[PDB]
Design a protein around this ligand. Sequence first.
Ligand code: M6O
Ligand SMILES: CCCCCCCCCCCCCC(=O)O
Ligand SMILES: CCCCCCCCCCCCCC(=O)O
Ligand SMILES: CCCCCCCCCCCCCC(=O)O
Ligand SMILES: CCCCCCCCCCCCCC(=O)O
Ligand SMILES: CCCCCCCCCCCCCC(=O)O
Ligand SMILES: CCCCCCCCCCCCCC(=O)O
Length: 581
Amino acid sequence: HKSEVAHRFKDLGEENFKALVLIAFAQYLQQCPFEDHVKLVNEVTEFAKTCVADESAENCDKSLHTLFGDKLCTVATLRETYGEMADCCAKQEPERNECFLQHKDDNPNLPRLVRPEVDVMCTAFHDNEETFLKKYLYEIARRHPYFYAPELLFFAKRYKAAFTECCQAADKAACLLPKLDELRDEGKASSAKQRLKCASLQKFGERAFKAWAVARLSQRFPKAEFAEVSKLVTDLTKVHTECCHGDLLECADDRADLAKYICENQDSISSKLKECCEKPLLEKSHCIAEVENDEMPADLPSLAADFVESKDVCKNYAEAKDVFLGMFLYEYARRHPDYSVVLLLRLAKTYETTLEKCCAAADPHECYAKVFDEFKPLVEEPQNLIKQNCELFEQLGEYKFQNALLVRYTKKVPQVSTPTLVEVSRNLGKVGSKCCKHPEAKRMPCAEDYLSVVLNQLCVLHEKTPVSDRVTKCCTESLVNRRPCFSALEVDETYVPKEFNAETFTFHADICTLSEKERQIKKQTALVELVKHKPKATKEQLKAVMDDFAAFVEKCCKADDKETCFAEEGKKLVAASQAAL
Ligand code: M6O
Ligand SMILES: CCCCCCCCCCCCCC(=O)O
Ligand SMILES: CCCCCCCCCCCCCC(=O)O
Ligand SMILES: CCCCCCCCCCCCCC(=O)O
Ligand SMILES: CCCCCCCCCCCCCC(=O)O
Ligand SMILES: CCCCCCCCCCCCCC(=O)O
Ligand SMILES: CCCCCCCCCCCCCC(=O)O
């Protein structure tokens, strides 16, 4: 390509080019206002149009990195605003771009983006659509410097669709608020998955990453030969390793190359991928990454005639240990798309341990003969956990399920603070409501994918303020042991009940004023504080106190007196509760 910027403009398109340039300059320049980024985007777009008109212009033949670095260094306020980032302008390429990458401030110091009223949002969307959508996109980009730009563009398109849909109805709030909350949760989950995968590739290792990719791609592509799966795994591992470095252009190029290979080798990968290969380059890899699992062949036999029964198994293992292990992992993942990736990894680790232990001794057939029975409990452990919690979800709604989870996880570990406990338990209740609505053939992957980010958030909260050692021990282990370590937690017999605080168990007239959500937050906080002050409370006593509280607040809001009902009857309720427990 003579002009790389002209190729980018012709492939992506004018609107996509402007959006991506804005997102990139906001991820790099985070303290400049919106108008400066708008002017920079307009100048870059005009230059790209001049390059498209003639490929032999003044500065059209130079690379994208040099043009981007020059546009970054043309900022007159760069030094006085950034300090260190301005020193990268003295470097050459690719040292200058690497220096700019090292200075991407993650989690900067900016005020949080408050959500305005639905009426104000719709009014601003109608009066000026572009300068509103792009303004919010610039804010989100400057607040998330390492977020993948095409994903941010996809989320922005979804937000624009939601705004166009809801602002044209009678009740705009009842339409917009659920969509806004769902989009916020999805964006948080996407960022959490990205950062977690990068941290796992850094800490755990390429071997664990390749095992995870083998399991995933074998579950997604069961009709593929193991050689194709292994090549795809190596390519995807390289792609993720290059994307975790931070260079957006090289990450996009690697993803595009992988998507091109997949769309060219469709005939040897899957059959449910024809739709994604017709989309442009911006959406091709995004569609491929979120494709359904292909149907497996029906004539697939058991894994007994190739891993336990037939001979030459120890020979194939000693000739290539990790190759045979990945072969077994792929052959096991292709059979069970309903299993979680961590479960298949545990099975592979167990098989590896059994082979390593019972191959340096004579007559190894008798050792691994009864080795598939060891897979029975490990498979039944999550299955028994799922179709019991949904059972509880069948007995109690999402709110009561979250309350029961709060009680349980406060009895198990009371050292954790109240707001973090409440947030994690509400997230767990949402996860249960989301994944229990699926049949038993898709519950485990949903639960795994959601519990991953839930426990990740729990531990990024726990690391900044460590309280209990057991919580830090559950995350300092392997990713296949986080959920087992957390489920192995029991009630804390070493915990001492904190002294009674009458100020915490006080309610006022504003409780009836708060919305349907904040009132639940306050009730859950009160429940957590009650469980923490009285941990030895049984189920009957807790249920009785909860019923007394429910009858107390319901007899004060819809009554005659407003203020002299919470401090009057509440003084009796707290004493009645302190009598028991
Ligand atoms: C529908 C499908 C999706 C379902 C998802 C269900 C729940 C949603 C999952 C995401 C949780 C998450 O991921 N939450 C963060 C995000 O961020 Al944030 O541990 Mo991250 O130490 O900082 O105000 Mo980003 O505080 O202490 O709690 Mo905002 O949490 O509101 O730390 Mo808010 O770097 O930090 O993560 Mo606290 O890992 O970069 O703006 Mo640790 O920071 O948006 O809010 O960014 O990190 C984490 O990405 O806050 C919270
Ligand atoms: C999640 C990343 C979104 C990036 C695109 C933002 C488009 C406009 C969003 C407006 C709403 C922001 C979130 C909210 O306040 O609920
Ligand atoms: C096709 C890739 C072959 C090389 C990678 C093999 C990885 C085998 C891992 C077996 C399970 C160990 C536990 C784990 O990886 O988390
Ligand atoms: C200054 C030039 C800025 C160019 C911005 C280009 C952003 C990358 C677009 C990549 C589109 C495809 C993404 C993918 O395939 O994963
Ligand atoms: C998240 C609230 C509880 C309801 C769902 C419980 C799911 C438990 C099993 C999780 C699936 C993955 C198991 C594993 O990590 O191997
Ligand atoms: C401070 C603790 C907050 C909640 C911690 C939850 C830990 C993960 C739980 C995963 C599901 C376990 C279900 C169960 O306990 O049977
Ligand atoms: C310790 C004396 C006061 C205890 C009051 C109960 C603590 C809050 C429990 C909330 C249960 C009801 C929840 C609801 O229905 O909204």
